[PDB]
Each structure stands twice: as C-alpha cells, then as structure tokens.
Swiss-Prot record, chains A, B:
Organism: Homo sapiens
Record-listed Na(+) 2 binding positions: A21, N26, S266, N298
Ranges per topology, Extracellular: 37-40, 115-181, 231-254, 311-350, 413, 494-496
InterPro entries in the cross-refs: Na/ntran_symport, Na/ntran_symport_noradrenaline, SNS_sf
Protein name: Sodium-dependent noradrenaline transporter
Amino acid sequence: AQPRETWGKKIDFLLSVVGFAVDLANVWRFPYLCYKNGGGAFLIPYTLFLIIAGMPLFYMELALGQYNREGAATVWKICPFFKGVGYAVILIALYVGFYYNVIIAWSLYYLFSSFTLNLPWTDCGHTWNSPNCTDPKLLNGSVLGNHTKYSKYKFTPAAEFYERGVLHLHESSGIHDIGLPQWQLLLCLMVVVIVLYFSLWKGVKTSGKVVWITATLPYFVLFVLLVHGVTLPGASNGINAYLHIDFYRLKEATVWIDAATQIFFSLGAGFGVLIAFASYNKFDNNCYRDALLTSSINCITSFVSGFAIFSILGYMAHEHKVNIEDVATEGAGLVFILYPEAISTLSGSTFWAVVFFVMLLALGLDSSMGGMEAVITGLADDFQVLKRHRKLFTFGVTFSTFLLALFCITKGGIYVLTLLDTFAAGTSILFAVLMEAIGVSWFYGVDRFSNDIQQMMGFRPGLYWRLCWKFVSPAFLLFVVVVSIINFKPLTYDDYIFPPWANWVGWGIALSSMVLVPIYVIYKFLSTQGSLWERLAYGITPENEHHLVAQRDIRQFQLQHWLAI
Amino acid sequence: AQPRETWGKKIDFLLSVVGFAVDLANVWRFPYLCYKNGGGAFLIPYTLFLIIAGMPLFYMELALGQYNREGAATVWKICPFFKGVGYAVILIALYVGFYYNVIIAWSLYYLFSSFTLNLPWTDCGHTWNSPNCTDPKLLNGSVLGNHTKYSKYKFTPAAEFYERGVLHLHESSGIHDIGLPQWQLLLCLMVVVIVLYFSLWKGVKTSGKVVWITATLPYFVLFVLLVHGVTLPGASNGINAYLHIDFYRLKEATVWIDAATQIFFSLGAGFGVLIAFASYNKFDNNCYRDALLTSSINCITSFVSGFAIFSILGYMAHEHKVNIEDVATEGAGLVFILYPEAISTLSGSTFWAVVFFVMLLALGLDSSMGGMEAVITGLADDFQVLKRHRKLFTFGVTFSTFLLALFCITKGGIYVLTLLDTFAAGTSILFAVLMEAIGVSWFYGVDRFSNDIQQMMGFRPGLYWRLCWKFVSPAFLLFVVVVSIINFKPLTYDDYIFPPWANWVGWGIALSSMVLVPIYVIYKFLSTQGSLWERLAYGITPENEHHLVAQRDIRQFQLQHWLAI
Ligand SMILES: CN(C)CCC=C1c2ccccc2CCc2ccccc21
Ligand SMILES: [Cl-]
Ligand code: NA
C-alpha cells in the first residue's frame, strides 16, 4: 500500500547515526574498569574490538539493512531460521531505553536545579539536597582534618545532591526494599516520554530534525572541559595516571566484556537501530565510508571523554585530600559526581552547567528515540496492522516504557538500573550479535552478501572485511560469550551487595531474550508441513527462493557454499 | 460466522449460576451478619431485599442476555451510550480476579498441609508455622484464664499459622514494604490458574462439566458438617443464638443497610457474569423460574451453612468455656482461623480438614471461572478477532491475572488484597449496577424489556416486576451507593493503619472503572457526526432502529416513554 518512507536529507542519516552513537558521555566509565597493574585496560581492548569487530559488524548491519530494506526482525527473511534475534534485539533496545529514560530524567532534574544562581553543589547546607549531617565536609570551603575514611568521597555536595537529593537512595535499603517512586522523578519521566512521543509519532523526518537540532554542538562541551582540564595547574596529575604509557604492563589479555558492551552501545550493534536506520536509507550509499567515519568519531569521542574524566579526577585528587581511585562513584552516576564539581570551579558555573545538562538531555533523548524508533520499525514491519496504526503503537510503547521504568526511578531504583543494564545489555547483545554473525556469514553466506554489496555499489569488500565477517568476528563473539558465562562475578554496587536471587532474576531476564532464537527455530520446524529435508531447506533458504526447495536445489547443503569465502 | 456454542443441558446452566451465586461470601459473612443484626430479625429485611431488590435484578440479566445473546460489554446495542458500563463490569471483574484467586490459593495450601495425621495447627512449634520466641500459648491444657476475646487473639496456633506460616506477615510492615512473593503460594496460584485455563479454554462445554463436580460437592460437605455438628456438645447454644428472634433492631444503622449489601454481594446480580451465562442458552428457555430457583438455592444454602458455622462456633465456645459472642468472627478468621482450630479438636480431624478445604476450593473455583468467563465473553463479542483465538486469549487473561496477583501473595499482600476488594468491588460494581439499571429501565424502557420476555417465553411479566425494575431497583442501588459514599471509613486492618496515600490510590482504582461511562459517552458523542440532536439520538436508540432516526422518529424524546411502566 504505502511506499517505503525515506529520509529527507542524506546528511540527516549521518547525523542520526552519531546522535544515537553519542553515549560515551555517561556509559564511558574508565575508572570503573580502570587498571590495577596493566596500565591500558579500557583503551587497548576498546580499540582492538572496534577494529576487529566494531567496523565489520557496523558495515555488515548497514549493508544488510540497506539491501533488504526491512526491519531488524524482517531482515531475517533471508534466513527465517535465525529470526528470533530480531525479537531479541528489539527486547534489548526496549530494556535499554527502560533505564536510559531514567538517565534522561536525572539530566532533566539537574538542568532544572541548575537554574538557581547558587548551585546546589557549592555549599554543605540544605541547598535542595539531603545531607546526613554526619560529615558536612566542604572540599575547599573550610579547613578539615586529613582523614581518608577508606579514601571514600560520598559526602561532597555533588554526591549528597546526587544520591540523596535526586535519587533518595538513603530511604531504600536495597533491591529487596525499593520503596516508592519519587514524584519529581515521576514528573521528569513523564516529560521525557511525552517529548519522545511527540518526536516519534510523526515519522522518521521529525526524528531527523530532532537529532539535527539537539546534536548540533555536543562536542563543544567536551572540548571546553578538556581545555579547562589541562590548562589548570593541578589537574595534570590524574591525566598523567590516565595516559600510562606501558607497553609491557599486562593485567588482562585484551579480553573484556564491558569493552564489547561499550563498543556495541556506541556503534549500535545488537540493538537493531543500525538496520532500522539503514532501511529508510537510499539504495546507493557508501556504507563503508560511513562506518569508518562513525568508528573514527566514536574513538575520538571516547578518547576525549576519558581525557576529561581523568582530568577532573586529578583535579579532585589535587584540590582535595583523598586519592583519585576512590574520589568518585564508579557506576551509572559517575558524570553526575564529576562534572558539577568541575563546573563549580570554572567561571560562570550556572551557564556552563546549564549547557552541559542541555547536552546530556539532547544526547539521551536522541539515543532513546533511536532505540524506540528501531523497536517500532521492527514491530511494524513484522505486523502491518502496527505499521498502519503508528500513533497508537507508539503511544502504547511509550506508556509501557514509562510504566516499566518506575522500578528504576524509585528510592532504590539505581540498583535495578545497574542490574538490568549489566545483565540484559551484556548477555543479550553478546548472544544476539553472535547469532547474527553466524546467520549472515555461515547460513546466509559471505559470498552472497558480498555479491549483494557489489550489486548495491561498485566497490566490493576485500579479503579483510569478509574474513572478519566469517572467521574473526564470530569466533571473537563466541569467545567473549564463553568468558562472560564462565568468568561471572555477582552483581554489586560500590558498597551494596545483592542477594543471590537478584543474580537469578538478571539471568532470567537475559535468557528471556536469549531463548528467542531457538524458540523461533522450533516454531519454523514445526510449522512447515514436510519431511526433514524440506523443513531444513525452508529453514535456511530465503523466502523469495523457496520455490527452489521444490526443485531440490539448495546451496547450503553442498560444502562448496560453506567453504567459499 | 459460525453460531456461538450453547449449553448442552439446562442443568449445566442452572448448576453454573448456582455455583456462581454460592461462594465463600455465603459462609463467613452471612451467619455473622445474621447474628449481629438481631439474630433472626435479620431475615425480615434480607428476604425483603431478596424479593424487591435482589430478585428483579436477577431476572433483568437472564432476560437481557438471552434475548440479546451477547457479552457483558456488547449487549449494550439497544443503547450505545451505556456500553461503557459494559466495559467497567469487565475491568471490575479483573480487579476482583486478582485477589480472589489468592483466597483460592489459601484453600489449596491448607489442603496439602491437611494430608498429614498431625495437622500444622494442632500444637505450638515450628510445624510449618513461624513461631514467636515466647509469645504463643497452647489452646488446650491451660486453665490460667483469658482477658481478651478469642476472635482477635493472634497468639493461637491456628491464627499464628495462618498469618506467619502462610501469609508471612510477621516479616512485613505494610504496603510500603510488601516483600517478595511466597513461592509456596506462587505454586498454588499457578495450579489454580492452570485449572482455570484448562476449564475455560474450550468454551462453556468444559466449564459446564467441571461445574457438575465443583457445584455439587460443597452441598454434601455442608450436609455432613451439619449432621456431625448437631451431635457436638455445645452446638445447641449456638443454634439458639443464631435463630434468636429479636425484633428490637429497628435502626437503619447496620440492620437495614447490611442485609441490602449482603443480598447484593451474595446473589451476584449486575456483575456481568449473568449476562455471559445467559448468552449461551436457548431462546425458548424460561428465565423466570431459573432466576427464582437460583435466588432460592443461594438463600437456602446460606441459611443452612449458617447452621454448621454456628454449631462449630458453639462447640468451640463450649470447649473454650467462653460465650458465643467472643468466638464470633467473619471472613478469613472464620474459615481459616476458627474452623480448622475447631476441626483440630474433633475425631478423625484429617477427613474433616480435607473435606472443609475442598469445599472452600469448590466454592471459589466456580466464582473465579464465572468472573473470568464474563471478561472472556465481553472481550470476544466486542473484538471479533478474539472469538477465533480463544485458547490463546484465555491463556493471556490467565497469565495477566497471575502476574497482577503477585502483589497479594507476597509477605504483605493481605493489605493490597483488602484495598482492592473493598474499593474496587464495592464502589465500582455499585456504580456499574446503578448505571445498568438506569440504562435498562429508563433509557431503553421496561415495556420493551417486557415485550422481549413475552416474545421469548410467551408470557409478559406483571406490573410488580416492572415496578421493581423501573423504580425500586434504581432507588435501592442509589441508596446503597449514597450510604457507601457517606459511611466510607478510612482503610484499616486489625492493628495496622493504612497510610493517607492508600485511600487515594484505592479511590483511583475504584474510579478507573466508574469513569469509563462518561468517557465512553464523550467518545460516542464525538465519534458520531451530525448535529447535537442527531448525535444524541444515535446513543439512546438501538443499532437496529437507527433508520427511524433518519425518519425523525425517536421514542426517547416523548413523554410517553418516560411515563410508561
Ligand atoms: C460470588 N458472586 C456473588 C460473585 C463473586 C465473584 C466475583 C468474581 C470472582 C472472581 C473473579 C471475578 C469476579 C467478578 C465478579 C465480582 C464482582 C464483585 C464482587 C465479586 C465478584
Ligand atoms: Cl447471601
Ligand atoms: Na461456587
């Protein structure tokens, strides 16, 4: 009926991929995975995975979504067997937006609080925060005793505003008792979901305009933070520990699960957002150049973000007493601790804080609307009734996201947020990208994919990209999944410990999306009325080429198809 | 499409409506309301409210669901402006379906525990019950004394078992800290919902056959319990106190408004279940005799169950050497705290303890199946897609009920259960039955409703039934609603007091169903196109009489319609 919708401008796609790719502000926590005796621990594995897995998977997803011109779930009409990975990545993006809207609400609350002339992080009083009053220690306001107290800095005005004034974490004991959702956080979440609905109910062109307006100057805040970090006298000590140039210090074997999760969140692999955005893209586009540009931009952004973060770390460690490693909270609120104290020192604390919070709101809204648009595109291409009624389905999705995010905005919502993020994100995106690589490279065929690319644009992927798609990336993803299943530590906060049932709940939430692949395989095997050979043929052959099943001509059965690279 | 299913035999429909009318509310509440409200003089208004206010509301649904063989919601095709109240009686049936099955779990977990020779409520200790350090005392063997009534004494083995060993309320403080759902009760709830799905997944065919067992065993259980209690020492005093005629009670407070609410919540007229059950019956079936027999069976069953209840209460009063007013209780305190404690002191306690709880299970199974089939039929006749997919829609409904009943089976779910029951049931179903009576007796017309009955069975209801449908029933429902609004008390438990925000959320849940009538009126007024008199005439006239609207012939705009009885 209605033709396939497309972008209004080609530059809109290159801006939207970055607006969804700008998550290195908050999700890039270097001191969390900081080194112990290795030096480079979150930059060597990050770059390695971006080189060997990031760019190949980005190019593969872009070309697949551009050629098939379908959603994440209906891209697997080229191999109906591995079609459960579409629902898997849809649930992945849904669970991710669930806690991403919480970060957006936190940023909105900080933006609303920063309007005051006196910032809430400039004194140790009752300035919109909730100090316990046991340790009202002004970092530079008054002289205090040099007591480390485990070198922990959680009584600073920034932390007292974050974990007590914004989150109200003191009222909740833990995951077992989360309390009631906060009213101000509820209003913030309602405003966020209303903005998302008003941005997404129109179409992809409105989302393109929104990512154009919001992502206009995200780099400027990072640039001014970096230029203020290194120019100030006492902030070089921490950044010196950051760029620890040790090529013979080794604490890991370049193996990290959090690095893979970070590259997948940055690029978008395992969420269906790349395929969904490539579906609306034009037929003739250089996905290779776009992938290289996106990877380079993400690498530079990660580098400058780590620079600024460790510069603020060293500034805190010099202007204050306790050491660098325990000065800030390593978790989902690292930037909320770092950036307010840094902006308090800089001139014009109110204006720059407002600008930084507007940037955070912009990037968060962009990423969340990208994920929600990917989910909507997938479930609309899957069910044409949902594609016809786009507004009702969008309203339903936004309302479900708002309802299922109340457990993350409550008194102890940060614990559920971290649990969901870690378990769901890591395990689900790992299994999803592994299954997608196995299906595209082996079952569908690297030769057929390369031929489709050559028919799409003149240039053909060389030996490097094909060998990465076929051998390097699937083996890497399988090894990461194995090291994640084996080397699994119990989920915990900086100080709070989770009961054993929280780990089981997280594993069950991950498995809910994981088992979506074998369930659909069994569904396809049982639905087809035929012999075992005919079932296996209908399983691993495209829908358009199903007639060849009747002609007894299947390429996957022969070993020449598998051996071909 | 294909014609809907029908009852193979009218005995199935009769037993189904009997099992729906006869539930746990006729065992724990009716005898206590009889005793407290003057003894025997409570039968004078009750039967009165049975005849003038309860019986005409039971003949109104069996004749509206048989002439218009539709669901609870879709039956409002004679007056679309009230179809919203057809949705409320569905949503209410969901709000009642969450906690009610929990009670069905309470009778299941007590059944398995009664499969041992030593019942868990016969002695003090850790016999499947969580005991206090030094608080509990033994019922028999102590002649020290007592200064408090045994109805609220929570230091007995049975009460402590019911609270801590079953509900686990000792490790909870209120709705703010409910805790995690009990797995030993989650398994019982799973078994209950599985039985419900297996009964209702293939239509009325399997439900009618399950009712043949689940609606005939409770009568045998009551018969054997009465024939055993009539020989128990001390039952004569209980029978005399239950049948004591005290005509001194002439006050409206608790004597004239308690029999009305008891009749209303015992007969079940206006819940939407009767419209669904009467939609699978033949067009020539007599609804008059069916309604009369159902009301008489309900009232006689309540009256004869009061005999066994008070025989057990008199036996316990003689054993405890206390008066009957001290061992007089209602609700779960009777069937779970008072009756098992009395069975403990009987001979062959295993048989009686198994048969009492299997009667309690059979009483709840019929009511839950009816309340769920009401929603099923109301949503299937409205949405034609759900008619073909019944085995999936019933499964979805059961799974949603199970997931939304996890807040009542937890360590502190009794408070949420009481909140839901009281607010939702009372307020929403009262407003719903009031709107239904107003729509059927005034807007549609009692003369047309009598002509429909005359076309169905051949005879037309006399002037008494029309007078009790047009004037008596609406005024009675309005009086009950006004009393419920005025005599509304703040939510409270035995000792715990609900927070101020509990009353507001309870009222919100109650209004969620009640606002569906004005919202649907506005929706119907805005959807229809034309002038005000052309949009109003399309919501008060039947869909088969809309052509008369084009001919400027509307009967609801004349004085003869409103002044005809
Ligand atoms: C026992 N007769 C009187 C009806 C009792 C049963 C229910 C019930 C039970 C289980 C599931 C749904 C429902 C919906 C109908 C309703 C409405 C108000 C109060 C109670 C009830
Ligand atoms: Cl009754
Ligand atoms: Na029953």
